[PDB]
Amino acid sequence: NSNICEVCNKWGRLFCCDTCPRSFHEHCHIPSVEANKNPWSCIFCRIKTIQERCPESQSGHQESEVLMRQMLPEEQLKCEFLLLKVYCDSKSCFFASEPYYNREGSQGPQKPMWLNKVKTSLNEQMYTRVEGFVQDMRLIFHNHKEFYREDKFTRLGIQVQDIFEKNFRNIFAIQETS
Template sequence: MATGTNKKSIRNDNVEWFTPTEFEISGGRKRSKKWKESIRCYEWTLKELIEKELLPNPPKKKRKLENSQQCTVCSQGRNLYPCGSCGKFYHEKCHIPPVEDESGPWSCVFCKIKDQAKCQENQACHKESEVLKRKMLPEEQLKCELLLLTVYQEPKCCFFISKPKQSKEDFPDLKEHMWLNKVKNRLNKKAYHSVKHFVADMRLIFHNHSIFYKDQRFGNLGDTTRKLFEKNFKRIFSIKKTSKQLQPCKQTVLFT
């Protein structure tokens, strides 16, 4: 294992040798694609054994890509990781969560949603109040990662990535400075305990922006990005419309 994850380092009871990814597939965990967490030695995952330095941490293997290829999020090149399912490219930290660089196949969050989802007709939609109360279980974590990544892919989001330069002292109504990279960091660390807390931070970004640029042309920029977020929030979490022209929800995303 010390030489890399493409080496056969795990032996089964039939004295057959496998790479970690091959062993994961042989155990029926092909879709997880996280062998460090799915493979166990007794009660310990390989990830825990590596962290305790009881197993060597396999060296990362960079994939050489052509200069013409660009990151789906930032549109820059170099040191990109291809999704094994859709073929799109991401930088390690542009993707949410960060790419786990392993020699085996890797799937972006869009494909993970697609792999786990089954769209069915005539499914009941959810109330927003019910969605916000949900605990941040793996299904909700994945949806929030997808939602945040859709915002990062919007060109106008660059205005909200870094910490605002405005001083809190100049804006007494400001509750807390909030920006996309701060939300991303919290989400990657799994610091949100419910969907409500994640959505509240996202909405705070645009609320603060409306305070900073009240009656200014930059105010429209925040409103446009906020509408994009709200639209995708309702779509990804299958939240039903509240307008008078309520249409029946024909699709929802179910997780197995």
């Protein structure tokens, strides 16, 4: 197996996947690495299995249909993996913990949002449809863009949003378009 965490790229107390060579810190994996289970399969492996079981699940889909899906176990897992993919980028540090807003010429957002809050919300089964998860994720980046206005720091939101959106289109097999 790898000797660094797949998400944060640091060594430490790592748990190894039994079906691929990836490794994770306990709370870097989503969901948090399960207490027992031998063998253990990581979230990348569990997603691959879903695809292999139902090859047709990779045919193109309309976003509007994806968003209305209820959060049954497979959709819950897909949102966990998509959240994980965002944490995999080092620029996610900017969006992880609860923000605060005190900048001359800007007002803070009405509904602040951050990755660790989405993470908790997923863990607590608070989202009933895919749409709830995707709306909170997009709100993170939209709040950022709106607050930082013309500061070049706004680009960090564009950058991590692009990682989110590309992974959303891949995981949920959104029909390709120009």
